[PDB]
């Protein structure tokens, strides 16, 4: 019931600015401060600063004051964070995190993260290709198929099958970085060689920074 929803992926050019949002919904926004925590890849959490809605009073992480600015809008129950003079050190995931002010910064409800990438480069949609379910792609009567999601910039895309009807045995791998500098991933699924005859498999790729959308079909 208590939902924190932040923006989407941001692709920003070095030195620009970015503002990501966070609408909180399911509680009374005005008796709960609101935090922002950075998370670089394969790295731990870093609190940035936190704000109360009632006056937009802030307090900051003593190394982020110069990069981060927090702006509140109780009338929409949304909090904001802006990052300025952007470099590659500010490429990470930033979560919205709620806490009680009357007790302290224990963040019981957190957002869902917004991948921020700081690149001179333009977005590029991926080339959704299918993965061929063959008979050398078989072991015990069960077949493995998928969708390759090749040549996208930047992170991330979201892969799902049958619009979410299918969660069983799905493997959407971390993206690798090619020689070319564009990400590329797979998101296979193992399945009985029985259903193949009479069952349909559609990858639901969405690379949001480029507004790309594909529902390619994976057949033998």
């Amino acid at each position: 019931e208590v939902q924190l929803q932040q923006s989407g992926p941001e692709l920003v050019k070095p030195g620009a600015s970015v503002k990501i949002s966070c609408k909180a919904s399911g509680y009374t926004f005005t008796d709960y401060y609101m935090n922002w925590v950075k998370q670089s890849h394969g790295k731990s959490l870093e609190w940035i600063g936190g704000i109360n809605p009632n006056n937009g009073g802030t307090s900051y992480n003593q190394k982020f004051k110069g990069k981060a600015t927090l702006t509140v809008d109780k009338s929409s129950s949304t909090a904001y964070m802006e990052l300025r003079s952007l470099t590659s050190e500010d490429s990470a995931v930033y979560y919205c995190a709620r806490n009680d002010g009357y007790r302290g910064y224990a963040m019981d409800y957190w957002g869902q993260g917004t991948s921020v990438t700081v690149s001179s480069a333009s977005t590029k949609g991926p080339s959704v290709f299918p993965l061929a379910p063959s008979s050398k792609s078989t072991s015990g009567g069960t077949a493995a198929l998928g969708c390759l999601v090749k040549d996208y910039f930047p992170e991330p895309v979201t892969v799902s099958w049958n619009s979410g009807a299918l969660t069983s045995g799905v493997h959407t791998f971390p993206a690798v970085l090619q020689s070319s500098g564009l990400y590329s991933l797979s998101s296979v699924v193992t399945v009985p060689s029985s259903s193949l005859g009479t069952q349909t498999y559609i990858c639901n790729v969405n690379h949001k920074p480029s507004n790309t959308k594909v529902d390619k079909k994976v057949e033998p």
């Binding site: 959490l45 910064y105 224990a106 993965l131 792609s137 971390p174 690798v176």
Partner: protein, 216 residues
């Protein structure tokens, strides 16, 4: 300026065992007025935001199972799990809020299980791709343990090098295994210069290296 230091940086464990990570703080986290400890534990399962386990150092957030107990006072703390589930794989962070919030490095919780041997597959480059001048062939190592697994692509019995990129998933939260995708990409014109396209697999759950292959 408090320094939160968690040891160990990572550990493994079987389902059912008992886990105990600690979290020393450079500064005492106890408030004489409160007699409450200003430390929280968060959990972060692969691909998810940090979820609160324990606040006030001792108190469970609601909906957090009785298996996680918070313990410690002042400078030294400890998170405990009594009967490790296969789903508890995550990175556990201690944070202090006795002043401006600071985190620990985290402690990575790996699960321990038996040797599973990997299922090998292989994928031809699709039409829609080859019809663009590129040619990516794919090897899928599904559900093995441990995470070490060598994967040599061979073309016409010629060992390649420098033309493939591996990707490993995180541990499954039911079976505790791993999946591994090994993509081999070269030019369509290099594609149609050979015949044999194989994927030789070394592992521990394999006695004899498993090759899967196909012909153009």
């Amino acid at each position: 300026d408090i320094v939160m230091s968690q040891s160990p940086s990572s550990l493994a464990v079987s389902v059912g065992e008992k886990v105990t990570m600690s979290c020393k703080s450079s500064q005492s986290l106890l408030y004489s007025s409160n007699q409450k400890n200003y430390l929280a534990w968060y959990q972060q399962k692969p691909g998810q935001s940090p979820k609160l386990l324990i606040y006030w150092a001792s108190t469970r957030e609601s909906g957090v199972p009785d298996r996680f107990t918070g313990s410690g006072s002042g400078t030294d703390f400890t998170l405990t799990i009594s009967s490790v589930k296969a789903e508890d794989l995550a990175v556990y962070y201690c944070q202090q809020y006795y002043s401006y919030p600071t985190f620990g490095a985290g402690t990575k919780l790996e699960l321990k299980r038996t040797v599973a041997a990997p299922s090998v597959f292989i994928f031809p480059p699709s039409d829609e791709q080859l019809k663009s001048g590129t040619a990516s062939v794919v090897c899928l190592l599904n559900n093995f343990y441990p995470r070490e697994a060598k994967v040599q692509w061979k073309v016409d019995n010629a060992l390649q090098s420098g033309n493939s990129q591996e990707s490993v998933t995180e541990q499954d939260s039911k079976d505790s295994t791993y999946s591994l995708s090994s993509t081999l990409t070269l030019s369509k014109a290099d594609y149609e210069k050979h015949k044999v396209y194989a994927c030789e697999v070394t592992h521990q759950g394999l006695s004899s290296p498993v090759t899967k292959s196909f012909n153009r």
